[PDB]
Write an enzyme that holds these catalytic residues in place. Sequence first.
Site, PDB file in Angstrom:
ATOM      1  N   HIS A 178       0.815  -1.208   0.000  1.00 63.44           N
ATOM      2  CA  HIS A 178       0.000   0.000   0.000  1.00 63.44           C
ATOM      3  C   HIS A 178       0.848   1.257   0.000  1.00 63.44           C
ATOM      4  O   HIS A 178       2.053   1.236   0.274  1.00 63.44           O
ATOM      5  CB  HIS A 178      -1.071   0.004   1.125  1.00 63.44           C
ATOM      6  CG  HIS A 178      -0.566   0.479   2.455  1.00 63.44           C
ATOM      7  ND1 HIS A 178       0.538  -0.067   3.075  1.00 63.44           N
ATOM      8  CD2 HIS A 178      -1.027   1.438   3.291  1.00 63.44           C
ATOM      9  CE1 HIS A 178       0.748   0.552   4.223  1.00 63.44           C
ATOM     10  NE2 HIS A 178      -0.190   1.466   4.378  1.00 63.44           N
ATOM     11  N   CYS A 192       3.709   5.385   5.570  1.00 60.38           N
ATOM     12  CA  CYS A 192       3.805   4.169   6.356  1.00 60.38           C
ATOM     13  C   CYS A 192       5.248   3.719   6.408  1.00 60.38           C
ATOM     14  O   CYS A 192       6.008   3.895   5.456  1.00 60.38           O
ATOM     15  CB  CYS A 192       2.947   3.067   5.761  1.00 60.38           C
ATOM     16  SG  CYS A 192       2.675   1.614   6.822  1.00 60.38           S
ATOM     17  N   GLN A 217      -7.528  -2.612   9.811  1.00 59.73           N
ATOM     18  CA  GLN A 217      -8.696  -1.752   9.764  1.00 59.73           C
ATOM     19  C   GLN A 217      -9.619  -2.206   8.638  1.00 59.73           C
ATOM     20  O   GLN A 217      -9.196  -2.483   7.505  1.00 59.73           O
ATOM     21  CB  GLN A 217      -8.305  -0.297   9.604  1.00 59.73           C
ATOM     22  CG  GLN A 217      -7.446   0.177  10.733  1.00 59.73           C
ATOM     23  CD  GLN A 217      -7.046   1.616  10.603  1.00 59.73           C
ATOM     24  OE1 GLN A 217      -7.886   2.501  10.648  1.00 59.73           O
ATOM     25  NE2 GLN A 217      -5.753   1.862  10.468  1.00 59.73           N
ATOM     26  N   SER A 264      -6.121   5.715   9.532  1.00 59.13           N
ATOM     27  CA  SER A 264      -4.714   6.065   9.306  1.00 59.13           C
ATOM     28  C   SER A 264      -4.536   7.188   8.303  1.00 59.13           C
ATOM     29  O   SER A 264      -3.652   8.032   8.465  1.00 59.13           O
ATOM     30  CB  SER A 264      -3.917   4.850   8.859  1.00 59.13           C
ATOM     31  OG  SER A 264      -4.114   3.812   9.788  1.00 59.13           O
ATOM     32  N   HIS A 316      -5.376   5.261   1.394  1.00 60.27           N
ATOM     33  CA  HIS A 316      -4.508   4.208   0.860  1.00 60.27           C
ATOM     34  C   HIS A 316      -4.734   3.989  -0.647  1.00 60.27           C
ATOM     35  O   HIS A 316      -5.856   4.155  -1.149  1.00 60.27           O
ATOM     36  CB  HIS A 316      -4.817   2.869   1.560  1.00 60.27           C
ATOM     37  CG  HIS A 316      -4.806   2.936   3.059  1.00 60.27           C
ATOM     38  ND1 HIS A 316      -3.787   2.400   3.816  1.00 60.27           N
ATOM     39  CD2 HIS A 316      -5.695   3.456   3.941  1.00 60.27           C
ATOM     40  CE1 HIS A 316      -4.051   2.579   5.098  1.00 60.27           C
ATOM     41  NE2 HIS A 316      -5.196   3.229   5.200  1.00 60.27           N
TER      42      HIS A 316
HETATM   43  N1  LIG Z   1      -8.977  -5.063  14.341  1.00 59.70           N
HETATM   44  C1  LIG Z   1      -8.520  -3.833  14.095  1.00 59.70           C
HETATM   45  N2  LIG Z   1      -9.345  -2.894  13.628  1.00 59.70           N
HETATM   46  N3  LIG Z   1      -7.236  -3.550  14.322  1.00 59.70           N
HETATM   47  C2  LIG Z   1      -6.676  -2.224  14.053  1.00 59.70           C
HETATM   48  C3  LIG Z   1      -5.589  -2.500  13.009  1.00 59.70           C
HETATM   49  C4  LIG Z   1      -4.839  -1.238  12.595  1.00 59.70           C
HETATM   50  C5  LIG Z   1      -3.411  -1.430  12.037  1.00 59.70           C
HETATM   51  N4  LIG Z   1      -3.251  -0.678  10.771  1.00 59.70           N
HETATM   52  C6  LIG Z   1      -3.897  -0.781   9.595  1.00 59.70           C
HETATM   53  O1  LIG Z   1      -4.800  -1.581   9.361  1.00 59.70           O
HETATM   54  C7  LIG Z   1      -3.425   0.190   8.529  1.00 59.70           C
HETATM   55  C8  LIG Z   1      -3.600  -0.421   7.143  1.00 59.70           C
HETATM   56  C9  LIG Z   1      -2.255  -1.130   6.833  1.00 59.70           C
HETATM   57  C10 LIG Z   1      -1.165  -0.259   7.552  1.00 59.70           C
HETATM   58  C11 LIG Z   1      -1.940   0.439   8.642  1.00 59.70           C
HETATM   59  C12 LIG Z   1      -1.423   1.205   9.645  1.00 59.70           C
HETATM   60  C13 LIG Z   1       0.023   1.549  10.001  1.00 59.70           C
HETATM   61  C14 LIG Z   1       0.393   3.012   9.684  1.00 59.70           C
HETATM   62  O2  LIG Z   1      -0.651   3.917  10.079  1.00 59.70           O
HETATM   63  P1  LIG Z   1      -0.708   4.411  11.635  1.00 59.70           P
HETATM   64  O3  LIG Z   1      -0.950   3.207  12.518  1.00 59.70           O
HETATM   65  O4  LIG Z   1       0.550   5.160  11.997  1.00 59.70           O
HETATM   66  O5  LIG Z   1      -1.878   5.356  11.776  1.00 59.70           O
HETATM   67  N5  LIG Z   1       0.991   0.566   9.487  1.00 59.70           N
HETATM   68  C15 LIG Z   1       1.940  -0.154  10.127  1.00 59.70           C
HETATM   69  O6  LIG Z   1       2.628  -0.938   9.483  1.00 59.70           O
HETATM   70  C16 LIG Z   1       2.255  -0.055  11.613  1.00 59.70           C
HETATM   71  N6  LIG Z   1       3.629   0.409  11.770  1.00 59.70           N
HETATM   72  C17 LIG Z   1       1.318   0.834  12.448  1.00 59.70           C
HETATM   73  C18 LIG Z   1       0.852   0.128  13.709  1.00 59.70           C
HETATM   74  C19 LIG Z   1      -0.350  -0.589  13.705  1.00 59.70           C
HETATM   75  C20 LIG Z   1      -0.779  -1.239  14.865  1.00 59.70           C
HETATM   76  C21 LIG Z   1      -0.013  -1.171  16.033  1.00 59.70           C
HETATM   77  C22 LIG Z   1       1.188  -0.454  16.043  1.00 59.70           C
HETATM   78  C23 LIG Z   1       1.620   0.194  14.881  1.00 59.70           C
HETATM   79  C24 LIG Z   1      -2.903  -2.849  11.910  1.00 59.70           C
HETATM   80  N7  LIG Z   1      -2.815  -3.597  13.014  1.00 59.70           N
HETATM   81  O7  LIG Z   1      -2.541  -3.251  10.818  1.00 59.70           O
END
Ligand SMILES: N=C(N)NCCC[C@H](NC(=O)[C@@H]1CCC/C1=C\[C@H](COP(=O)(O)O)NC(=O)[C@@H](N)Cc1ccccc1)C(N)=O
EC number: 5.2.1.8
Length: 146
Positions: free
Chosen positions: A42, A96, A114, A137, A140
């Site tokens: 992404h 990201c 998400q 976030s 995308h």
């Molecule tokens: N059940 C649910 N709803 N759980 C929520 C899941 C949310 C999370 N994120 C995403 O889904 C979006 C889409 C892909 C990348 C992303 C977020 C980020 C960049 O966006 P930000 O987070 O800075 O806003 N990407 C990364 O790689 C990680 N360093 C970020 C990260 C995610 C989770 C924990 C710690 C760090 C995930 N666990 O993957």
Amino acid sequence: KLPPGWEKAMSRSSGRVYYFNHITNASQWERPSEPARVRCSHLLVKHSQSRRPSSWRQEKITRTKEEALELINGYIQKIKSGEEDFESLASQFSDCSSAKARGDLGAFSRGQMQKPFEDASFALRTGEMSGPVFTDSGIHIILRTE
Ligand SMILES: N=C(N)NCCC[C@H](NC(=O)[C@@H]1CCC/C1=C\[C@H](COP(=O)(O)O)NC(=O)[C@@H](N)Cc1ccccc1)C(N)=O
């Protein structure tokens, strides 16, 4: 009968029919034709209403959703025209961490991402790219690689 999410639309400028997917936000002229896991890359553009208005590119992200969408739209144009490839623009421009891996996130199943991202990712076929996908976030462009 058109894969999940696909609908017929009518071009405003040309009157030609096209196909839109309301899950992935993909748009195409061509007629379009589930797994445990998918692999995706992404390109994220964050804005000021992002759950975390900060990235490796800039400490404070101050652009609006509208400006972020403008950027996303321009990247999609360059990718579709072949002027730039997805991986190059993810590396340079994704807000990201995964930018360092050409936007690659690895494989994932339902329940990890998400929900809009996940739904989009699972409605793409291998090889296909999304239009703008909105999450907490940011915005995308999603490419399904496996
Ligand atoms: N059940 C649910 N709803 N759980 C929520 C899941 C949310 C999370 N994120 C995403 O889904 C979006 C889409 C892909 C990348 C992303 C977020 C980020 C960049 O966006 P930000 O987070 O800075 O806003 N990407 C990364 O790689 C990680 N360093 C970020 C990260 C995610 C989770 C924990 C710690 C760090 C995930 N666990 O993957």
